[PDB]
């Protein structure tokens, strides 16, 4: 019994090709600021009457360097900023919340009746 090994655990204490959907861009530019200054692939395209939403965002794929700064920022409010994976799948966000089947739990007697 007494013969043992020994040990001490001091726990006890004792490719990417990012794109922008021109349909959904709102021209906020939160992704432009993330683009590296010299790259500046993301640019503004104006149709007219800025308040009517003419201004939009576009990524010049030639200028883009797949640095992921635009998309990884989680800055796109509209979801226009997308990432096409090397095999191919459009990502509107770095991680979308899981889909849920929701219901309001109203108790019977004590807390939230009915």
């Amino acid at each position: 019994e007494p013969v043992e090994n020994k040990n001490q655990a001091p726990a006890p204490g004792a490719k990417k090709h990012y794109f922008i959907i021109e349909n959904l861009c709102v021209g906020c530019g939160l992704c432009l600021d993330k683009c590296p200054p010299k790259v500046n692939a993301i640019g503004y395209k104006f149709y007219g009457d800025v308040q009517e939403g003419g201004f939009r965002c576009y990524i010049d794929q030639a200028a883009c360097i797949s640095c992921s700064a635009c998309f990884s920022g989680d800055e796109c409010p509209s979801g226009a900023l997308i990432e096409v994976l090397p095999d191919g799948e459009v990502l509107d966000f770095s991680y979308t919340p899981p889909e849920r089947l929701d219901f309001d739990l109203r108790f019977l007697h004590r807390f939230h009746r009915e």
């Binding site: 807390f111 939230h112 009746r113 009915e114």
Partner: protein
């Protein structure tokens, strides 16, 4: 009879059956115009359930 008297002292406790928004409104009513206004709230809602 328990619900209505508990309401006259604790109206939001009476509307606890109702939605959280109604419960918060009844609590605010206790805070402002305590009893008369909030007692009115509880009696309206409880009589409506009837």
């Amino acid at each position: 009879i328990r619900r209505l008297i508990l309401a006259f002292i604790l109206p939001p406790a009476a509307v606890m059956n109702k939605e959280a928004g109604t419960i918060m409104l009844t609590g605010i009513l206790t805070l402002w115009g305590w009893i008369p206004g909030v007692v009115a709230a509880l009696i309206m809602i409880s009589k409506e359930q009837s």
